Amino acid sequence: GKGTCILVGGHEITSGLEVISSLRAIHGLQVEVCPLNGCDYIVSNRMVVERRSQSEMLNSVNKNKFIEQIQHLQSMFERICVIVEKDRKSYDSLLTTLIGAGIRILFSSCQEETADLLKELSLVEQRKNVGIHVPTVSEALQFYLSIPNISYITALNMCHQFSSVKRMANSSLQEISMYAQVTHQKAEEIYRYIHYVF
Amino acid sequence: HIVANEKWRGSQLAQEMQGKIKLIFEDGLTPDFYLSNRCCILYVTEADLVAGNGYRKRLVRVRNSNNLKGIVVVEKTRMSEQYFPALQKFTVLDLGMVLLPVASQMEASCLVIQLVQEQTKEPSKNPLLLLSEPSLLRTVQQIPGVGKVKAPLLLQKFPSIQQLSNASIGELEQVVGQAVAQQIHAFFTQ
Numbered sequence: 001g002k003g004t005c006i007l008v009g010g011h012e013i014t015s016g017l018e019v020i021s022s023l024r025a026i027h028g029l030q031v032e033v034c035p036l037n038g039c040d041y042i043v044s045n046r047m048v049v050e051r052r053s054q055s056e057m058l059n060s061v062n063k064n065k066f067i068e069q070i071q072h073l074q075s076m077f078e079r080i081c082v083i084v085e086k087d088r089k090s091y092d093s094l095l096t097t098l099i100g101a102g103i104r105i106l107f108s109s110c111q112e113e114t115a116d117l118l119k120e121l122s123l124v125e126q127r128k129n130v131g132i133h134v135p136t137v138s139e140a141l142q143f144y145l146s147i148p149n150i151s152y153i154t155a156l157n158m159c160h161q162f163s164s165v166k167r168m169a170n171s172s173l174q175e176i177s178m179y180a181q182v183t184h185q186k187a188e189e190i191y192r193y194i195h196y197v198f
Numbered sequence: 199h200i201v202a203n204e205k206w207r208g209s210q211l212a213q214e215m216q217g218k219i220k221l222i223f224e225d226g227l228t229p230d231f232y233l234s235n236r237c238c239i240l241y242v243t244e245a246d247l248v249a250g251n252g253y254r255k256r257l258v259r260v261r262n263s264n265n266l267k268g269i270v271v272v273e274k275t276r277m278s279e280q281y282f283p284a285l286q287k288f289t290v291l292d293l294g295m296v297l298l299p300v301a302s303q304m305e306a307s308c309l310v311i312q313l314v315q316e317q318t319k320e321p322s323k324n325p326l327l328l329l330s331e332p333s334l335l336r337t338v339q340q341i342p343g344v345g346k347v348k349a350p351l352l353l354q355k356f357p358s359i360q361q362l363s364n365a366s367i368g369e370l371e372q373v374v375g376q377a378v379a380q381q382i383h384a385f386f387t388q
Contacts, residue, residue, distance in 0.1 A: 148333050
């Protein structure tokens with residue numbers, strides 16, 4: 001249950017400090033604060049989690065902004081989960097598009113409960129062998145980050161698991177899929193990127 | 199228009215749907231509603247949030263079905279509030295389904311309506327359902343130590359990141375020379 005890694009966006013230190021605090025001090029897992037410019041929590045390779053208040057979700061003026069954020073996340077992540085947390089009616093359409101897109105949705109009463117939810121999501125993904133464990137350190141990171149549609153954790157375990165960025169560039173789609181920890185079609189997309197000729 | 203369980207004839211749910219959706223009442227079926235031949239709804243009452251097994255085995259049955267995609271809807275009220283976190287741990291995390299809290303069954307009416315509207319309407323009607331060369335220049339620009347001007351000149355001699363990766367210090371000397379040429383080969387090697 002404990003030891004499992006989890007990535008947290010810097011903006012969450014002001015937004016959800018009790019969540020991060022409950023993750024680290026109660027459930028005792030290795031949390032790492034990172035610069036994930038477009039998302040809250042990376043809970044495994046492949047899965048991102050997004051927390052939003054019930055007020056925010058009901059205020060359907062960020063209805064379209066939220067949808068566009070999910071779209072940006074869809075490009076980088078195989079599985080997407082959103083936690084609607086209670087704060088300290090016409091939006092049923094928002095929920096149905098999410099469900100219809102295969103996006104998992106959780107409901108929380110407080111930041112403490114949200115931490116329990118994130119802990120539990122971590123274990124499920126650990127049991128599925130898509131667990132996140134890696135060094136999370138080396139500065140060839142930025143080069144991998146410049147590739148479109150590549151999550152921070154993908155780029156991370158591209159630095160690790162590949163001996164050279166040279167050998168990464170000459171790897172067959174089968175081994176980039178496995179070593180970069182990405183999908184079968186995703187491996188083809190970055191392959192067409194590295195192998196694109198002018 | 200959508201298939202329902204006989205359990206629901208003449209109820210508040212059915213009364214509020216009757217106008218916007220037509221209902222076919224079938225006997226004995228495991229879900230409470232069928233949206234399609236690959237998707238269905240399981241309804242959970244405030245009443246059977248009493249640590250009882252009145253819903254649990256139904257949800258598991260649906261999980262066993264190879265194609266059927268179940269989505270659970272539950273009455274969340276002051277009394278059932280305490281039991282919700284366990285339902286959600288079981289349904290969404292253990293079973294991998296969708297759970298939808300709902301105050302009244304009058305709220306479930308509006309929800310199921312919009313849930314049908316979502317399902318019946320064409321694919322990619324919801325927003326959540328292409329190589330860029332500028333990005334490639336940005337990516338090469340990330341290799342030390344090349345900026346906005348050296349980047350395109352390298353890609354000219356070596357049309358891809360692949361060809362750039364297995365490029366000899368000699369060939370790199372020609373286009374950029376000295377330290378910069380060795381700085382690109384050092385980046386790729388080890």
